[PDB]
């Protein structure tokens, strides 16, 4: 299928090139260099075709990934293959850097020859049997990303959470695991949708499997309803003639008072013609940065069911006042030690029928780490 496969750096030169078919020529890589890196027409599509020649491009670190073919293949498979190539590169030599790429010629050549022939991608499959641990221990990490579009009128415009499971098991033998959570859909939550690892067996739906060795992701899931909102933002904008704006932003901690927030980031929008801003903060530190048109107020810790606010004076430069300032939404970035979804783990039944040790020998470790995704409050 795939013939030539070429990679660039930010400087634009060819780094490593191999072609599996007679169809691809140097003209392809040259046109890719000229028409992507050297072409100033930025607006494009992630794929392109010139003179019946398909070009595939993606940028990571400062490295271009170029794939070229003649036929009507499926894009997704090739893209997955490219992601796999990049990921195995990162695994083999950590950070992806130009010299780091360079010092691996034999690795590159042997991998491309093995993993890929003539454009065809070549490559219990998750855990062996000889794994032993006298200290049967497992760790649970609950990672959830909160997404909110918040209206100036006090209604949630959109809300949805992307959640993934991260677990670190160290157990002897071939443990048989049954995951128990409030899947009643009294504690109960509803799973909007979910995708799993290969080890998960379909047969409330519970998860029965033998976990892979070490750290792995059991399942991928999405939640959209009944999401606990971490924060509430109260916008207030006042215009003062043609020289000043009076904007005071209030934020509500929508979680338990016993919970302390960490690394609170609030980005307050200001116009480009802002002549200056005076910062007032009772908690943390507040800064004004005229460059990117933002007011930086950071709160180290601030408890739930509580409130914090910033008093700001936004001094405007007189300008073409007829075209009014279109207010961007108020964005906040934060990390919470709880899951906004509300998931509750009933149990994790892990049993080893083969070896003569009980479930009490397992040290099961659980923690919640919530992250902010897109959290914007329109004003």
């Amino acid at each position: 299928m795939i013939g030539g496969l070429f990679i660039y750096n930010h400087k634009g030169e060819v780094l490593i090139s191999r072609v599996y078919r007679d169809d691809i020529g140097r003209n392809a890589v040259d046109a890719f260099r000229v028409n992507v890196i050297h072409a100033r027409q930025q607006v494009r599509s992630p794929v392109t075709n010139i003179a019946r020649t398909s070009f595939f491009h993606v940028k990571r670190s400062n490295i271009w990934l170029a794939a070229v073919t003649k036929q009507n293949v499926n894009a997704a498979m090739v893209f997955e293959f490219l992601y796999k190539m990049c990921d195995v590169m990162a695994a083999y030599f950590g950070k992806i850097s130009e010299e780091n790429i360079k010092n691996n010629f034999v690795l590159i050549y042997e991998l491309l020859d093995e993993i890929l022939d003539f454009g065809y991608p070549q490559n219990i499959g998750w855990r062996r049997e000889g794994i032993k641990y006298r200290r049967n221990e497992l760790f649970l990490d609950v990672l959830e990303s909160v997404n909110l579009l918040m209206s100036p009128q006090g209604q949630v415009l959109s809300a949805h959470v992307s959640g993934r499971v991260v677990m670190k098991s160290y157990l002897s033998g071939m443990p048989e695991c049954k995951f128990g959570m409030n899947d009643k859909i009294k504690q109960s939550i509803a799973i909007d949708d979910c995708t799993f690892h290969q080890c998960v067996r379909l047969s409330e739906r519970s998860i029965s499997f033998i976990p892979p060795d070490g750290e792995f992701e059991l399942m991928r899931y999405r939640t959209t309803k009944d999401i606990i909102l971490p924060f509430r933002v109260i916008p207030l904008v006042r215009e003062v003639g043609r020289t000043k704006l009076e904007v005071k932003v209030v934020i509500k901690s929508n979680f338990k008072p016993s919970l302390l927030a960490q690394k609170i980031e609030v980005r307050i929008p200001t116009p480009l013609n802002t002549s200056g801003v005076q910062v007032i903060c009772m908690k943390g530190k507040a800064k004004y940065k005229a460059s990117e048109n933002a007011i930086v107020w950071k709160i180290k810790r601030m408890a739930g069911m509580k409130e914090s606010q910033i008093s700001a004076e936004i001094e405007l430069l007189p300008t073409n006042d007829k075209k009014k300032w279109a207010r961007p939404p108020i964005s906040m970035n934060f990390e919470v030690p709880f899951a906004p979804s509300g998931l509750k783990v009933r149990y994790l039944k892990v049993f080893e029928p083969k070896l003569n040790y009980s479930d009490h020998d397992v040290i099961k470790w659980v923690r919640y780490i919530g992250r902010s995704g897109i959290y914007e409050t329109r004003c």
Binding site: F139, P337, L348, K364, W365, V366
Partner: peptide, 5 residues
Amino acid sequence: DYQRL
């Protein structure tokens, strides 16, 4: 942080 399950 991690809590005993």
